[PDB]
Amino acid sequence: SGFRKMAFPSGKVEGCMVQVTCGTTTLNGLWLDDVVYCPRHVICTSEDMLNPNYEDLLIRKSNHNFLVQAGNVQLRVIGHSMQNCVLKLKVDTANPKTPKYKFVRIQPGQTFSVLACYNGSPSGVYQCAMRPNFTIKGSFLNGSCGSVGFNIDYDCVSFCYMHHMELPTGVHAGTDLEGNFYGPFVDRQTAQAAGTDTTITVNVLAWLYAAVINGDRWFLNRFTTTLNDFNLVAMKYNYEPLTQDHVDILGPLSAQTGIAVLDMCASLKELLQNGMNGRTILGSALLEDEFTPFDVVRQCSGVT
Amino acid sequence: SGFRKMAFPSGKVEGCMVQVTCGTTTLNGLWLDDVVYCPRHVICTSEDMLNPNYEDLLIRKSNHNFLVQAGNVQLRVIGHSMQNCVLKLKVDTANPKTPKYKFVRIQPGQTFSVLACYNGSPSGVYQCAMRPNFTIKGSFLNGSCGSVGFNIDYDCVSFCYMHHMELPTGVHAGTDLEGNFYGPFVDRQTAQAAGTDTTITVNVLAWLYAAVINGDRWFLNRFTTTLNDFNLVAMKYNYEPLTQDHVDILGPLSAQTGIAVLDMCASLKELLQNGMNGRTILGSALLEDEFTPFDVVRQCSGVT
Ligand SMILES: O=C(Cc1cccc(Cl)c1)Nc1ncn2ccccc12
Ligand SMILES: O=C(Cc1cccc(Cl)c1)Nc1ncn2ccccc12
C-alpha cells in the first residue's frame, strides 16, 4: 500500500552519461554503443543562440573540437553528424555499460523518468509527463541539457526525451533521441509561448483507481455518466476529451476494483464540479494526472 | 527552474540488491563487502509472525538455509548473525559493486530515497521522509522488505532505512542498518498504531523558499512574526515547533531570497489560517513538508 510518484531505477542510464564540451559550452551527452548523442546547441556561444544557423556553425567544428569525457577518461571522437536537433559523435570505444535500448517518440499524456545531469554526472531522478502542449514540467538548471527521459521494460531502456530548453515560463522543451522536438519548439533563444496545459483525463482516472486500491474511497459516488456527458464537463475544465480507446486502456483497473469506467468518470465529474472540499486523495489536494494506467498497475503489482 | 520531488540516482544501490530466501519466505537483502543485510523476519513463516521468538527460530537455521542470489548467481553463506532486527549473512565473496558507504540513523523530518525492490530486483525509486511519528509514507507491496532508504554525498551512500513492515493504516515502519526500528515498532504481526503525523515545519518553510526561487510568490505577505507567536499557530495546526536551530538551518535560503526567516514564518502563518483559496504553490494545493532545506539548496544548485 501507499502510492508514490515513482521513477524507474536509474542505474542503466547513469552508465551512459558523459560530458560534452565544444568551445566554451559544456552539457551532457548519452553514450550508447560507439555514439554520443547530445543537443546540437553545444556548438553555440550564448550570442549564437539568438539566431543560429546550425549547419554554418557546424562547418567550423572538427572531431577534435568535441571534448567527450566519460567519468574521468576522455573519449576519442572519430566522426560527427547532425540529425535534426541532435549531434551524434562517433567515438572509438563502445560504451561497455550500454544497456539494451530503443529510441521511442512518446505521445502527450505518457510519463517517463528523467535523470537530471550536470557535467556528465547525475544529480537526481524524477518522474514527469509529456504535457498535451508538448512541454514537460521538469527541474532543470543551466548545464542540464542533454539529460534524458526514459522508460524501462525489464532490461530494455526506451529513451524518449533529451532536454534542450527552458521556456520563459519555466517549463521545458526537448527532443526525442532522433533530434525532433516535441511540439513546435525550436532551439533558438526566442520567446516561444506554450499552448493550453490541459489535464490528462485518462491519467486522472487511473490515479483515482490507484486511490481506491490504496483505500482512499471518499470520492466514490452513486452516479454514472456517458462519454459524451463526461466530455462536456471535461471541456469546461480544460481536461482532454475521453475516448473509448482511453476506456479500453482503463479496463484492467476497472476489473481490479469492480468500478465501471463510466462510474469512475461520474466521480471525476463531481470532483470537478464540487472540488475536494478541503479533503485529500493519496496525499494530494488536487487531481494528479502524471500517472498513466500502465504506471498504476505497475506500481500496484510490483513489476521489476 | 521547476521543482520536483527528486530522488538520488539509484545505480550505486541497485548494485547492492540481492534476493534472500529462507524456507518459503523471500525478501531483499543489501550486499556490502562480504555481508548481506536483511530483515530477520525472513526466518518466519506467516504463522510465526503472530508471536515470534527470533532467537529460538534462528537456532533451527544454518548457513545453508539462507539462499542468497545476486542477479542469477548464488552466493555462498559462510556465517550468520542477528543484530537487533536484521540478519547479517556473511558470504564468501565481496560485492564487486560495493560503493563507498556509511550506515546512518536519521532524525524525523529528514528525507531519503527508497529503491523499492522485489526478489532482489529494483522496481522503482521515490523520495520520502522519516515522519515525526517515525513511520514513512512509502509504496511497498508484499516481498518489498529489505528495500532500503539512503542519501548520497558525491560518491558515498549513507544507508538510513531498511523496510520491514506495513502497519494496518498503510504506513510503513523499518529499521536503520543496525537493525533498530525507527520509533516504537516491533517486527510482530500485532496491530500497532502510529502517533500524530505532524507537519515538518522547517521543511514547509524550505519548500516555500524553493517556491519563491522558482517564481511562485503570491503567498508572500507584508507581515512578520516571532518564534513564540508562530509556534502558537504551529501547535494549533499540528505542525512541529520551530526552533532557532531550524531558523539557523534556513539561513542560506533566507540569504538567497532576501526574505527573513520570520517573515517567511508569517507567510506560512497566513497560509495556515486562510488556506490556499483554490490556488497552488509549485503545482501543489497543500503545503509540502518532504523537502529539507538541504534538499532545496541541492536541487536549486545542481549538486551531482
Ligand atoms: O535553456 C537552456 C539552454 C538553451 C538556451 C537557449 C536556447 C536553447 Cl535551444 C537552449 N538550458 C536550461 N534548461 C534549464 N535551465 C534553467 C536555467 C538556465 C538555463 C536552462
Ligand atoms: O508487512 C510486511 C511484512 C511483515 C508482516 C508482518 C510483520 C512484519 Cl515484521 C513484517 N510487508 C509489507 N510491506 C508492505 N506490504 C504491503 C502488502 C503486504 C505486505 C507488505
How far are the Cα atoms of A272, B12, B148 from residue B159, in angstroms, in the given order?
Answer: 42, 11, 7
Collapsing DSSP states into helix, strand and coil, what is residue B55?
helix
Planar angle of CA A216, A240, A164, nearest 5 degrees: 100
Pocket flag, ligand 1, residue A212 (CB < 6 Å):
no
Neighbours of A286 (CB within 10 A): 19
Helix (H) or strand (E) segment spanning residue A127? strand A121-129
> Determination technique for this PDB entry?
X-ray
Collapsing DSSP states into helix, strand and coil, what is residue A254?
helix
Report the candidate in B119, B54, B101, B52 with the shortest Cα–Cα distance to residue B80.
B54
A171/chain B closest Cα distance in angstroms = 7
Give, for ligand 2, the residue of B26, B54, B164 to mutate: max count of ligand atoms closer than 8 Å to Cβ: B164
Parallel, antiparallel or unpaired: strands A66-70 and A17-22 = antiparallel
Q: For residue B55, what are the contacts with CB-CB under 8 A and spacing of at least 6?
A: B82
Exposed / middle / buried, residue A278 (Cβ in 10 Å: 0-12, 13-18, 19+): exposed
Overall size of chain B counted in residues: 304
Pocket flag, ligand 2, residue B166 (CB < 6 Å):
yes
Tell me whether residue A246 is one of the annotated catalytic residues. Answer: no
β-strand partners of A181: A175
Distance of CA B137 to the CA centre of its chain: 8
Q: Which amino acid is at B16?
A: C
Measured CA to CA, the distance from residue A22 to residue B203 in angstroms comes to 40
Note the resolution in Å, 1 decimal. Answer: 1.5
Helix axes A201-213, A261-274, angle to 10 degrees: 100
E strands, chain B, in order = 17-22, 25-32, 35-39, 66-70, 73-75, 77-83, 86-91, 100-103, 111-118, 121-129, 148-153, 156-166, 172-175
Smallest Cβ–Cβ distance between A4 and the set B2, B138, B171 belongs to B138
Helix axes B201-213, B293-301, angle to 10 degrees: 20
B59/chain A closest Cα distance in angstroms = 33
Q: Are A5 and A127 in contact (CB under 8 A)?
A: yes
Report the separation in Å between the CA atom of B222 and the middle of ligand 1, taken as the mean of its atom positions. Answer: 33
Supply the DSSP symbol for A179: S
Measured CA to CA, the distance from residue B76 to residue B90 in angstroms comes to 9
Exposed / middle / buried, residue B178 (Cβ in 10 Å: 0-12, 13-18, 19+): middle
Report the separation in Å between the CA atom of B140 and the middle of ligand 2, taken as the mean of its atom positions. Answer: 8
Distance of CA B65 to the CA centre of its chain: 31
Measured CA to CA, the distance from residue B134 to residue B149 in angstroms comes to 14
Distance of CA A144 to the CA centre of its chain: 14
A179: alpha, beta or left? (left if phi > 0; alpha if psi -120 to 50): left
Measured CA to CA, the distance from residue B129 to residue B206 in angstroms comes to 14
Smallest Cβ–Cβ distance between B115 and the set A9, A137, A302 belongs to A9
Q: For residue B107, what are the contacts with CB-CB under 8 A and spacing of at least 6?
A: B130
Supply the DSSP symbol for B253: H
- Which numbered ligand comes closest to the C-alpha of A44? 1
Note whether B9 contacts A7, CB cutoff 8 Å: no
Q: Is B215 on the interface with A (CB under 8 A)?
A: yes
B41: alpha, beta or left? (left if phi > 0; alpha if psi -120 to 50): alpha
List own/partner pairs for B249-258 with CB under 8 A and 24 or more apart.
Answer: B249/B202, B249/B293, B250/B202, B250/B205, B250/B206, B250/B209, B250/B293, B252/B293, B252/B297, B253/B205, B253/B206, B253/B209, B253/B210, B253/B293, B253/B296, B253/B297, B254/B209, B256/B209, B256/B213, B256/B300, B257/B209, B257/B212, B257/B213
β-strand partners of A160: none
How far are the Cα atoms of A87, B51, B118 from residue B40, in angstroms, in the given order?
Answer: 52, 14, 17
Helix (H) or strand (E) segment spanning residue A29? strand A25-32
Q: Is B125 on the interface with A (CB under 8 A)?
A: yes
Query: Which three three-digit cell numbers place residue A90?
Result: 562517433
Q: Are B116 and B59 in contact (CB under 8 A)?
A: no
A105, A109, A115, A118 alpha-carbon torsion, rounded to 10° = 80
Measured CA to CA, the distance from residue A290 to residue A281 in angstroms comes to 14
Contact list, A285 vs chain B (CB under 8 Å): 276, 284-286
A224, A230, A232, A238 alpha-carbon torsion, rounded to 10° = 140
Q: Are A103 and A95 in contact (CB under 8 A)?
A: no
Report the candidate in A193, A201, A205, A202 with the shortest Cα–Cα distance to residue A135.
A193
Task: Tell the residue number behind the cell numbers 508471536, with chain if given.
Answer: B51
Report the candidate in B211, B217, B205, B180 with the shortest Cα–Cα distance to residue B269.
B205
Measured CA to CA, the distance from residue A200 to residue A238 in angstroms comes to 9
Measured CA to CA, the distance from residue A183 to residue A85 in angstroms comes to 13
Buried b (16+ CB within 10 A) or exposed e, A148-183: bbbbbeeeebbbbbbbbbbeeebbbbbbbbebebbb
Collapsing DSSP states into helix, strand and coil, what is residue B88?
strand
Contact list, A281 vs chain B (CB under 8 Å): none
Report the candidate in A93, A99, A81 with the shortest Cα–Cα distance to residue A37.
A81
Give, for ligand 1, the residue of A47, A135, A144 to mutate: max count of ligand atoms closer than 8 Å to Cβ: A144
Buried b (16+ CB within 10 A) or exposed e, A20-54: bbbeebbbbbbbbebbbbbbbbbbbeeebeeebeb
Parallel, antiparallel or unpaired: strands B111-118 and B148-153 = antiparallel
Measured CA to CA, the distance from residue A150 to residue A159 in angstroms comes to 4
Note whether A299 contacts B1, CB cutoff 8 Å: no
Domains along the sequence of chain A with CATH:
1-14+100-197 (2.40.10.10), 15-99 (2.40.10.10), 198-301 (1.10.1840.10)
Smallest Cβ–Cβ distance between B139 and the set A3, A144, A170 belongs to A3
Pocket flag, ligand 2, residue B190 (CB < 6 Å):
no
Task: Tell the residue number behind the cell numbers 520520502, with chain if given.
Answer: B128
Q: Is B17 on the interface with A (CB under 8 A)?
A: no
Distance of CA A231 to the CA centre of its chain: 26
Note whether B125 contacts A6, CB cutoff 8 Å: yes
Helix ranges restricted to H, chain B = 11-14, 54-59, 201-213, 227-236, 244-249, 251-257, 261-274, 293-301
Tell me whether residue B160 is one of the annotated catalytic residues. Answer: no
Q: Are B180 and B203 in contact (CB under 8 A)?
A: no
Give the dihedral sign, CA A110/A116/A117/A123. negative
Query: Which three three-digit cell numbers place residue A38?
Result: 547530445
Smallest Cβ–Cβ distance between A304 and the set B15, B118, B170 belongs to B118
A146/chain B closest Cα distance in angstroms = 14
Report the separation in Å between the CA atom of A226 and the middle of ligand 2, taken as the mean of its atom positions. Answer: 40
Collapsing DSSP states into helix, strand and coil, what is residue A187?
coil
Measured CA to CA, the distance from residue B280 to residue A234 in angstroms comes to 20
Measured CA to CA, the distance from residue B199 to residue B201 in angstroms comes to 6
Measured CA to CA, the distance from residue A24 to residue B68 in angstroms comes to 50
